[PDB]
Amino acid sequence: AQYEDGKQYTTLEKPVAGAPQVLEFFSFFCPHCYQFEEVLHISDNVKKKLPEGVKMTKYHVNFMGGDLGKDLTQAWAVAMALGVEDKVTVPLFEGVQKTQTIRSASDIRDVFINAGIKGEEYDAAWNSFVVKSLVAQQEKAAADVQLRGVPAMFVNGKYQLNPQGMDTSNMDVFVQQYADTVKYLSEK
């Protein structure tokens, strides 16, 4: 067939019940994740091709960058709780990987302030139990699929994208193949 288990995707031997329809994992420390988000715009191109009624979820992971890595998982929870993902994703990626000006929790906070989130609003969220449960959700989702590397994308807790089985000579074409594959897996 054109889409083959083991080639564009793999099937989890241990399916995860009640998993989000499309679930992407990343880390702000992850160089390929920077490419995915900043250069390739994977999340955005998948979304444009997803059928109606399927929502997209994106979670941060703890297993890169040590203490700051965990701070970033908590900051991403804040991002989700306030609904400001599209305001802080670029400066967080550039702050960690490009300018390397993010070295502490306070530096992370500065990014949100610069993005227009009020200090008190950030701080209240950071310390909130709603954010603690968001952090838990992120950890649980990664745990459910034995996650050990990023970037990663899962469809219906049953299938895992396998971008290594794709030509990368043209970045445009890789992205649309990636996106067309998620749609195919979505319709399975």
Short mmCIF file of all heavy atoms in Angstrom, two decimals, residues 86-150:
data_model
loop_
_atom_site.label_atom_id
_atom_site.label_comp_id
_atom_site.label_asym_id
_atom_site.label_seq_id
_atom_site.Cartn_x
_atom_site.Cartn_y
_atom_site.Cartn_z
N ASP A 86 0.35 30.85 21.14
CA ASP A 86 0.78 31.49 19.89
C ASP A 86 1.51 32.79 20.13
O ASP A 86 1.99 33.42 19.18
CB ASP A 86 -0.41 31.78 18.98
CG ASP A 86 -1.08 30.53 18.49
OD1 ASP A 86 -0.45 29.45 18.54
OD2 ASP A 86 -2.23 30.64 18.04
N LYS A 87 1.62 33.19 21.39
CA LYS A 87 2.36 34.41 21.71
C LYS A 87 3.71 34.11 22.30
O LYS A 87 4.63 34.95 22.19
CB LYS A 87 1.57 35.30 22.68
CG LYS A 87 0.32 35.90 22.11
CD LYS A 87 -0.48 36.59 23.18
CE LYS A 87 -1.68 37.32 22.56
NZ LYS A 87 -2.43 38.10 23.58
N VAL A 88 3.86 32.95 22.93
CA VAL A 88 5.10 32.66 23.65
C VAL A 88 5.93 31.56 23.02
O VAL A 88 7.10 31.40 23.36
CB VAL A 88 4.84 32.30 25.14
CG1 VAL A 88 4.19 33.45 25.85
CG2 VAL A 88 3.99 31.02 25.27
N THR A 89 5.37 30.81 22.08
CA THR A 89 6.13 29.70 21.47
C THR A 89 7.41 30.17 20.74
O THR A 89 8.47 29.60 20.93
CB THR A 89 5.26 28.90 20.47
OG1 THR A 89 4.19 28.23 21.18
CG2 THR A 89 6.10 27.86 19.75
N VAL A 90 7.31 31.22 19.94
CA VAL A 90 8.50 31.68 19.21
C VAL A 90 9.57 32.26 20.16
O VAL A 90 10.73 31.86 20.08
CB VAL A 90 8.12 32.71 18.10
CG1 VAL A 90 9.38 33.46 17.62
CG2 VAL A 90 7.47 31.99 16.93
N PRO A 91 9.20 33.20 21.07
CA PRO A 91 10.25 33.72 21.97
C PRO A 91 10.83 32.69 22.93
O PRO A 91 11.97 32.83 23.36
CB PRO A 91 9.55 34.83 22.76
CG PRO A 91 8.10 34.70 22.48
CD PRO A 91 7.96 34.00 21.16
N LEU A 92 10.06 31.67 23.31
CA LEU A 92 10.64 30.63 24.14
C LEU A 92 11.65 29.80 23.35
O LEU A 92 12.74 29.52 23.83
CB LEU A 92 9.56 29.74 24.73
CG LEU A 92 8.74 30.41 25.85
CD1 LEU A 92 7.57 29.49 26.25
CD2 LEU A 92 9.59 30.75 27.06
N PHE A 93 11.29 29.38 22.14
CA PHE A 93 12.23 28.63 21.32
C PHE A 93 13.51 29.46 21.05
O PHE A 93 14.62 28.96 21.18
CB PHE A 93 11.58 28.22 19.99
CG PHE A 93 11.05 26.80 19.97
CD1 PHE A 93 9.71 26.54 19.71
CD2 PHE A 93 11.90 25.73 20.18
CE1 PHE A 93 9.24 25.24 19.68
CE2 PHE A 93 11.44 24.42 20.15
CZ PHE A 93 10.10 24.18 19.89
N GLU A 94 13.33 30.72 20.70
CA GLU A 94 14.49 31.56 20.38
C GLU A 94 15.28 31.88 21.64
O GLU A 94 16.51 31.96 21.62
CB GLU A 94 14.04 32.83 19.65
CG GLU A 94 13.35 32.49 18.33
CD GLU A 94 13.24 33.68 17.37
OE1 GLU A 94 13.35 34.84 17.82
OE2 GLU A 94 13.04 33.43 16.17
N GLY A 95 14.58 32.02 22.76
CA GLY A 95 15.26 32.31 24.01
C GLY A 95 16.13 31.15 24.48
O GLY A 95 17.24 31.36 24.99
N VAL A 96 15.64 29.93 24.30
CA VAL A 96 16.43 28.76 24.67
C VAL A 96 17.52 28.42 23.66
O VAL A 96 18.64 28.11 24.06
CB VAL A 96 15.52 27.52 24.89
CG1 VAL A 96 16.35 26.29 25.18
CG2 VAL A 96 14.59 27.79 26.04
N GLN A 97 17.20 28.45 22.36
CA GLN A 97 18.11 27.92 21.35
C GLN A 97 18.84 28.96 20.50
O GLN A 97 19.90 28.67 19.97
CB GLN A 97 17.38 26.96 20.41
CG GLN A 97 16.90 25.71 21.15
CD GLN A 97 16.34 24.65 20.22
OE1 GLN A 97 16.96 24.31 19.21
NE2 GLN A 97 15.19 24.10 20.58
N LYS A 98 18.26 30.13 20.32
CA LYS A 98 18.89 31.10 19.41
C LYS A 98 19.75 32.09 20.19
O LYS A 98 20.97 32.15 19.99
CB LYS A 98 17.84 31.83 18.58
CG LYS A 98 18.48 32.80 17.54
CD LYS A 98 17.41 33.56 16.79
CE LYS A 98 18.03 34.45 15.70
NZ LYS A 98 16.99 35.21 14.95
N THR A 99 19.12 32.90 21.02
CA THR A 99 19.84 33.88 21.83
C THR A 99 20.44 33.31 23.12
O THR A 99 21.34 33.90 23.72
CB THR A 99 18.92 35.05 22.21
OG1 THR A 99 17.80 34.52 22.94
CG2 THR A 99 18.39 35.73 20.97
N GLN A 100 19.91 32.16 23.55
CA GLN A 100 20.30 31.51 24.79
C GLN A 100 20.29 32.47 25.97
O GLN A 100 21.23 32.54 26.75
CB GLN A 100 21.66 30.84 24.68
CG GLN A 100 21.72 29.77 23.61
CD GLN A 100 23.03 29.01 23.64
OE1 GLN A 100 23.95 29.34 24.40
NE2 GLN A 100 23.12 27.99 22.81
N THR A 101 19.17 33.18 26.11
CA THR A 101 18.97 34.16 27.16
C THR A 101 18.00 33.64 28.22
O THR A 101 17.71 34.31 29.21
CB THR A 101 18.42 35.47 26.58
OG1 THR A 101 17.29 35.18 25.75
CG2 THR A 101 19.49 36.18 25.73
N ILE A 102 17.52 32.42 28.02
CA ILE A 102 16.68 31.78 29.03
C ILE A 102 17.49 30.76 29.83
O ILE A 102 17.87 29.71 29.33
CB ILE A 102 15.45 31.12 28.38
CG1 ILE A 102 14.55 32.19 27.77
CG2 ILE A 102 14.69 30.31 29.44
CD1 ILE A 102 13.40 31.61 26.96
N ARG A 103 17.79 31.11 31.08
CA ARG A 103 18.63 30.28 31.94
C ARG A 103 17.97 30.01 33.29
O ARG A 103 18.47 29.21 34.08
CB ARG A 103 19.99 30.93 32.15
CG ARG A 103 20.54 31.46 30.82
CD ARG A 103 21.88 32.15 30.96
NE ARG A 103 21.79 33.43 30.28
CZ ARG A 103 21.47 34.55 30.91
NH1 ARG A 103 21.30 34.54 32.23
NH2 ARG A 103 21.43 35.67 30.21
N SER A 104 16.86 30.69 33.56
CA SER A 104 16.18 30.54 34.85
C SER A 104 14.70 30.67 34.67
O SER A 104 14.25 31.18 33.64
CB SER A 104 16.62 31.62 35.84
OG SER A 104 16.07 32.86 35.41
N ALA A 105 13.95 30.27 35.69
CA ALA A 105 12.50 30.45 35.71
C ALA A 105 12.14 31.92 35.51
O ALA A 105 11.15 32.24 34.85
CB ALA A 105 11.90 29.92 37.01
N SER A 106 12.94 32.81 36.07
CA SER A 106 12.66 34.23 35.94
C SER A 106 12.79 34.67 34.47
O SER A 106 12.00 35.48 33.98
CB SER A 106 13.60 35.06 36.83
OG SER A 106 13.39 36.44 36.62
N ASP A 107 13.76 34.10 33.76
CA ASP A 107 13.95 34.44 32.34
C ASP A 107 12.77 33.97 31.52
O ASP A 107 12.36 34.61 30.54
CB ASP A 107 15.24 33.83 31.77
CG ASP A 107 16.49 34.34 32.45
OD1 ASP A 107 16.46 35.47 32.99
OD2 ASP A 107 17.49 33.61 32.42
N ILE A 108 12.19 32.84 31.92
CA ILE A 108 11.00 32.33 31.27
C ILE A 108 9.85 33.31 31.51
O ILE A 108 9.11 33.67 30.59
CB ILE A 108 10.60 30.95 31.80
CG1 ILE A 108 11.67 29.92 31.43
CG2 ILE A 108 9.28 30.54 31.20
CD1 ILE A 108 11.44 28.53 32.06
N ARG A 109 9.71 33.75 32.75
CA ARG A 109 8.67 34.70 33.10
C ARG A 109 8.79 35.99 32.27
O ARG A 109 7.79 36.54 31.83
CB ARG A 109 8.74 35.01 34.60
CG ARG A 109 7.71 36.00 35.12
CD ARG A 109 7.78 36.11 36.64
NE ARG A 109 6.75 36.99 37.18
CZ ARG A 109 6.86 38.32 37.21
NH1 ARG A 109 7.94 38.90 36.71
NH2 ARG A 109 5.89 39.06 37.71
N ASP A 110 10.02 36.46 32.05
CA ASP A 110 10.26 37.67 31.27
C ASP A 110 9.65 37.58 29.87
O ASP A 110 9.10 38.56 29.33
CB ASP A 110 11.76 37.96 31.14
CG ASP A 110 12.38 38.44 32.44
OD1 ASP A 110 11.63 38.84 33.35
OD2 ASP A 110 13.63 38.43 32.54
N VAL A 111 9.75 36.40 29.27
CA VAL A 111 9.18 36.16 27.95
C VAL A 111 7.68 36.44 27.94
O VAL A 111 7.17 37.07 27.03
CB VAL A 111 9.45 34.72 27.47
CG1 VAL A 111 8.61 34.39 26.22
CG2 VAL A 111 10.95 34.52 27.18
N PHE A 112 6.97 35.94 28.96
CA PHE A 112 5.54 36.17 29.05
C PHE A 112 5.20 37.65 29.27
O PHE A 112 4.27 38.17 28.67
CB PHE A 112 4.91 35.33 30.17
CG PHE A 112 4.75 33.86 29.82
CD1 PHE A 112 5.85 33.02 29.72
CD2 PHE A 112 3.48 33.32 29.66
CE1 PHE A 112 5.69 31.66 29.42
CE2 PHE A 112 3.30 31.98 29.36
CZ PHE A 112 4.41 31.14 29.22
N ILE A 113 5.97 38.32 30.13
CA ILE A 113 5.80 39.76 30.39
C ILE A 113 5.99 40.56 29.10
O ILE A 113 5.18 41.43 28.78
CB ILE A 113 6.83 40.27 31.43
CG1 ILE A 113 6.72 39.50 32.75
CG2 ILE A 113 6.62 41.77 31.69
CD1 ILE A 113 5.41 39.67 33.43
N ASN A 114 7.07 40.27 28.39
CA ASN A 114 7.32 40.93 27.11
C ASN A 114 6.19 40.67 26.11
O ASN A 114 5.82 41.54 25.33
CB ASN A 114 8.64 40.44 26.53
CG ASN A 114 9.12 41.28 25.37
OD1 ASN A 114 9.19 42.51 25.44
ND2 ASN A 114 9.45 40.60 24.27
N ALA A 115 5.60 39.48 26.20
CA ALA A 115 4.47 39.13 25.35
C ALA A 115 3.16 39.77 25.79
O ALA A 115 2.14 39.59 25.14
CB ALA A 115 4.32 37.60 25.28
N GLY A 116 3.17 40.50 26.91
CA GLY A 116 1.97 41.21 27.33
C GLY A 116 1.11 40.55 28.40
O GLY A 116 0.05 41.07 28.77
N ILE A 117 1.55 39.41 28.90
CA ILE A 117 0.87 38.80 30.02
C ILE A 117 1.27 39.55 31.29
O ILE A 117 2.46 39.73 31.55
CB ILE A 117 1.20 37.29 30.15
CG1 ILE A 117 0.63 36.50 28.97
CG2 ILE A 117 0.65 36.74 31.46
CD1 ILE A 117 1.49 36.50 27.71
N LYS A 118 0.29 39.98 32.07
CA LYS A 118 0.57 40.74 33.29
C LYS A 118 1.33 39.89 34.30
O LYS A 118 1.04 38.71 34.46
CB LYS A 118 -0.73 41.27 33.93
CG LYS A 118 -1.51 42.28 33.08
CD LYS A 118 -2.68 42.84 33.89
CE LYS A 118 -3.77 43.39 32.98
NZ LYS A 118 -4.49 42.26 32.34
N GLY A 119 2.30 40.49 34.97
CA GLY A 119 3.09 39.79 35.96
C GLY A 119 2.27 39.05 37.00
O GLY A 119 2.48 37.87 37.28
N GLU A 120 1.30 39.75 37.57
CA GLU A 120 0.46 39.12 38.56
C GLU A 120 -0.36 37.96 37.96
O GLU A 120 -0.60 36.93 38.61
CB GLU A 120 -0.46 40.15 39.19
CG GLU A 120 -1.69 39.54 39.75
CD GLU A 120 -1.40 38.46 40.81
OE1 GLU A 120 -0.39 38.58 41.53
OE2 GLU A 120 -2.17 37.47 40.90
N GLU A 121 -0.75 38.12 36.71
CA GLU A 121 -1.55 37.12 36.01
C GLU A 121 -0.71 35.87 35.73
O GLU A 121 -1.16 34.73 35.93
CB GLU A 121 -2.07 37.74 34.71
CG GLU A 121 -2.96 36.88 33.85
CD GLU A 121 -3.17 37.50 32.48
OE1 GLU A 121 -2.57 38.59 32.21
OE2 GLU A 121 -3.92 36.91 31.66
N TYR A 122 0.52 36.08 35.28
CA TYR A 122 1.47 34.99 35.13
C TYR A 122 1.73 34.26 36.45
O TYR A 122 1.68 33.04 36.52
CB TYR A 122 2.80 35.51 34.55
CG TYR A 122 3.79 34.40 34.32
CD1 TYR A 122 3.77 33.66 33.14
CD2 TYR A 122 4.74 34.07 35.29
CE1 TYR A 122 4.66 32.63 32.93
CE2 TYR A 122 5.64 33.06 35.08
CZ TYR A 122 5.60 32.34 33.90
OH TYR A 122 6.49 31.32 33.70
N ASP A 123 2.01 35.03 37.50
CA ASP A 123 2.38 34.46 38.81
C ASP A 123 1.24 33.68 39.44
O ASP A 123 1.48 32.64 40.04
CB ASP A 123 2.84 35.56 39.76
CG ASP A 123 4.15 36.19 39.33
OD1 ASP A 123 4.88 35.53 38.54
OD2 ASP A 123 4.45 37.32 39.77
N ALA A 124 0.02 34.22 39.33
CA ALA A 124 -1.18 33.54 39.83
C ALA A 124 -1.36 32.21 39.12
O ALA A 124 -1.68 31.19 39.75
CB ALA A 124 -2.41 34.42 39.64
N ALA A 125 -1.21 32.24 37.81
CA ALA A 125 -1.34 31.03 37.01
C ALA A 125 -0.25 30.03 37.37
O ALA A 125 -0.54 28.85 37.64
CB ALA A 125 -1.31 31.36 35.54
N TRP A 126 1.00 30.50 37.44
CA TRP A 126 2.14 29.63 37.71
C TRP A 126 1.93 28.83 38.98
O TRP A 126 2.32 27.66 39.07
CB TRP A 126 3.43 30.46 37.82
CG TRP A 126 4.65 29.67 38.20
CD1 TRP A 126 5.10 29.39 39.46
CD2 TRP A 126 5.59 29.05 37.29
NE1 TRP A 126 6.25 28.63 39.40
CE2 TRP A 126 6.57 28.41 38.08
CE3 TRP A 126 5.67 28.96 35.90
CZ2 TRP A 126 7.64 27.71 37.52
CZ3 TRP A 126 6.74 28.26 35.35
CH2 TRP A 126 7.71 27.65 36.15
N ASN A 127 1.30 29.45 39.97
CA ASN A 127 1.14 28.85 41.29
C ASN A 127 -0.19 28.13 41.45
O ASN A 127 -0.45 27.53 42.50
CB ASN A 127 1.28 29.94 42.35
CG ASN A 127 2.70 30.45 42.47
OD1 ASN A 127 3.63 29.69 42.72
ND2 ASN A 127 2.88 31.75 42.24
N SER A 128 -1.05 28.20 40.43
CA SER A 128 -2.39 27.66 40.54
C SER A 128 -2.46 26.14 40.42
O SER A 128 -1.61 25.50 39.78
CB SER A 128 -3.29 28.29 39.48
OG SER A 128 -2.97 27.83 38.18
N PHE A 129 -3.46 25.56 41.08
CA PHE A 129 -3.76 24.14 40.97
C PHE A 129 -4.27 23.70 39.60
O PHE A 129 -4.10 22.55 39.22
CB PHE A 129 -4.66 23.74 42.14
CG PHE A 129 -3.90 23.68 43.43
CD1 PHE A 129 -3.84 24.78 44.27
CD2 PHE A 129 -3.13 22.57 43.73
CE1 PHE A 129 -3.07 24.73 45.43
CE2 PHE A 129 -2.37 22.51 44.89
CZ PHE A 129 -2.34 23.59 45.74
N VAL A 130 -4.93 24.61 38.89
CA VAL A 130 -5.35 24.32 37.53
C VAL A 130 -4.10 24.08 36.68
O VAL A 130 -4.06 23.17 35.86
CB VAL A 130 -6.20 25.46 36.93
CG1 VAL A 130 -6.23 25.39 35.40
CG2 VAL A 130 -7.62 25.43 37.51
N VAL A 131 -3.05 24.87 36.91
CA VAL A 131 -1.78 24.63 36.22
C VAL A 131 -1.09 23.33 36.68
O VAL A 131 -0.57 22.58 35.84
CB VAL A 131 -0.84 25.86 36.36
CG1 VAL A 131 0.63 25.49 36.16
CG2 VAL A 131 -1.27 26.92 35.36
N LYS A 132 -1.12 23.04 37.98
CA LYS A 132 -0.61 21.75 38.46
C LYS A 132 -1.28 20.55 37.78
O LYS A 132 -0.62 19.55 37.47
CB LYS A 132 -0.77 21.61 39.99
CG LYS A 132 -0.03 22.66 40.80
CD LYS A 132 0.11 22.28 42.26
CE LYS A 132 0.47 23.51 43.10
NZ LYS A 132 1.71 24.16 42.59
N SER A 133 -2.59 20.64 37.53
CA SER A 133 -3.28 19.52 36.88
C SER A 133 -2.94 19.47 35.39
O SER A 133 -2.93 18.41 34.79
CB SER A 133 -4.79 19.61 37.05
OG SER A 133 -5.28 20.81 36.47
N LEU A 134 -2.66 20.64 34.80
CA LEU A 134 -2.19 20.69 33.41
C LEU A 134 -0.81 20.03 33.29
O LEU A 134 -0.56 19.28 32.35
CB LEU A 134 -2.18 22.13 32.90
CG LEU A 134 -3.57 22.67 32.51
CD1 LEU A 134 -3.53 24.08 31.96
CD2 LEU A 134 -4.21 21.76 31.49
N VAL A 135 0.09 20.34 34.23
CA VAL A 135 1.39 19.69 34.28
C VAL A 135 1.23 18.17 34.39
O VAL A 135 1.87 17.40 33.67
CB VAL A 135 2.25 20.22 35.45
CG1 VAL A 135 3.51 19.37 35.63
CG2 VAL A 135 2.62 21.67 35.21
N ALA A 136 0.35 17.73 35.30
CA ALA A 136 0.06 16.30 35.44
C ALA A 136 -0.43 15.68 34.14
O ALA A 136 0.01 14.59 33.79
CB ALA A 136 -0.97 16.08 36.55
N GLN A 137 -1.35 16.34 33.45
CA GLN A 137 -1.87 15.84 32.19
C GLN A 137 -0.72 15.64 31.20
O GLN A 137 -0.65 14.63 30.50
CB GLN A 137 -2.92 16.78 31.59
CG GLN A 137 -4.29 16.73 32.28
CD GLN A 137 -5.19 17.88 31.84
OE1 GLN A 137 -5.70 18.64 32.67
NE2 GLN A 137 -5.38 18.02 30.54
N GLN A 138 0.16 16.64 31.10
CA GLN A 138 1.32 16.52 30.21
C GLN A 138 2.22 15.35 30.56
O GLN A 138 2.65 14.62 29.68
CB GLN A 138 2.15 17.80 30.22
CG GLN A 138 1.44 18.99 29.65
CD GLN A 138 2.32 20.21 29.68
OE1 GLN A 138 3.08 20.46 28.74
NE2 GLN A 138 2.22 21.00 30.75
N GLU A 139 2.51 15.18 31.85
CA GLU A 139 3.36 14.07 32.26
C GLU A 139 2.68 12.73 31.98
O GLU A 139 3.32 11.79 31.49
CB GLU A 139 3.74 14.17 33.73
CG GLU A 139 4.58 15.40 34.07
CD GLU A 139 4.97 15.44 35.55
OE1 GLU A 139 4.81 14.40 36.23
OE2 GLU A 139 5.43 16.49 36.02
N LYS A 140 1.39 12.64 32.29
CA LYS A 140 0.64 11.38 32.11
C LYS A 140 0.60 10.95 30.64
O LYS A 140 0.77 9.78 30.33
CB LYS A 140 -0.78 11.49 32.66
CG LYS A 140 -1.47 10.12 32.66
CD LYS A 140 -2.92 10.16 33.04
CE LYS A 140 -3.55 8.76 32.87
NZ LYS A 140 -3.86 8.34 31.46
N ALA A 141 0.35 11.91 29.75
CA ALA A 141 0.26 11.62 28.32
C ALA A 141 1.56 11.05 27.78
O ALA A 141 1.55 10.11 27.00
CB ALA A 141 -0.15 12.87 27.55
N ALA A 142 2.68 11.63 28.20
CA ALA A 142 3.98 11.15 27.77
C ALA A 142 4.25 9.76 28.36
O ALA A 142 4.83 8.88 27.72
CB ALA A 142 5.08 12.12 28.20
N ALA A 143 3.88 9.61 29.62
CA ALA A 143 4.03 8.34 30.30
C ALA A 143 3.21 7.24 29.60
O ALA A 143 3.69 6.12 29.46
CB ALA A 143 3.63 8.47 31.76
N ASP A 144 2.00 7.57 29.16
CA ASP A 144 1.10 6.60 28.53
C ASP A 144 1.71 5.94 27.29
O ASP A 144 1.40 4.78 26.98
CB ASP A 144 -0.24 7.26 28.12
CG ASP A 144 -1.18 7.51 29.30
OD1 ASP A 144 -0.90 7.01 30.41
OD2 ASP A 144 -2.19 8.22 29.11
N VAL A 145 2.57 6.67 26.58
CA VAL A 145 3.19 6.14 25.36
C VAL A 145 4.68 5.83 25.52
O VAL A 145 5.37 5.66 24.52
CB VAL A 145 3.02 7.09 24.16
CG1 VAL A 145 1.55 7.25 23.79
CG2 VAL A 145 3.62 8.46 24.47
N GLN A 146 5.17 5.76 26.75
CA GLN A 146 6.58 5.47 27.04
C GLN A 146 7.51 6.42 26.26
O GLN A 146 8.48 5.99 25.64
CB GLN A 146 6.86 3.98 26.70
CG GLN A 146 8.24 3.39 26.99
CD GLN A 146 8.29 1.91 26.59
OE1 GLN A 146 7.54 1.10 27.14
NE2 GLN A 146 9.11 1.58 25.62
N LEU A 147 7.18 7.71 26.28
CA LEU A 147 7.87 8.68 25.45
C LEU A 147 9.33 8.89 25.82
O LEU A 147 9.65 9.27 26.95
CB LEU A 147 7.14 10.02 25.52
CG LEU A 147 7.57 11.04 24.47
CD1 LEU A 147 7.13 10.58 23.08
CD2 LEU A 147 6.92 12.35 24.82
N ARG A 148 10.23 8.70 24.85
CA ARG A 148 11.66 8.86 25.12
C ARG A 148 12.37 9.76 24.10
O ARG A 148 13.58 9.99 24.19
CB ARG A 148 12.29 7.47 25.17
CG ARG A 148 13.72 7.40 25.63
CD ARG A 148 14.15 5.96 25.72
NE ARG A 148 14.16 5.27 24.43
CZ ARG A 148 13.24 4.38 24.08
NH1 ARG A 148 12.26 4.06 24.92
NH2 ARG A 148 13.31 3.79 22.89
N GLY A 149 11.62 10.32 23.16
CA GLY A 149 12.23 11.28 22.27
C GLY A 149 11.21 12.20 21.66
O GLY A 149 10.03 11.87 21.52
N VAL A 150 11.68 13.39 21.31
CA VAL A 150 10.85 14.38 20.65
C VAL A 150 11.63 14.90 19.45
O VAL A 150 12.85 14.70 19.37
CB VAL A 150 10.45 15.50 21.63
CG1 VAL A 150 9.34 14.99 22.59
CG2 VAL A 150 11.68 16.03 22.38
#
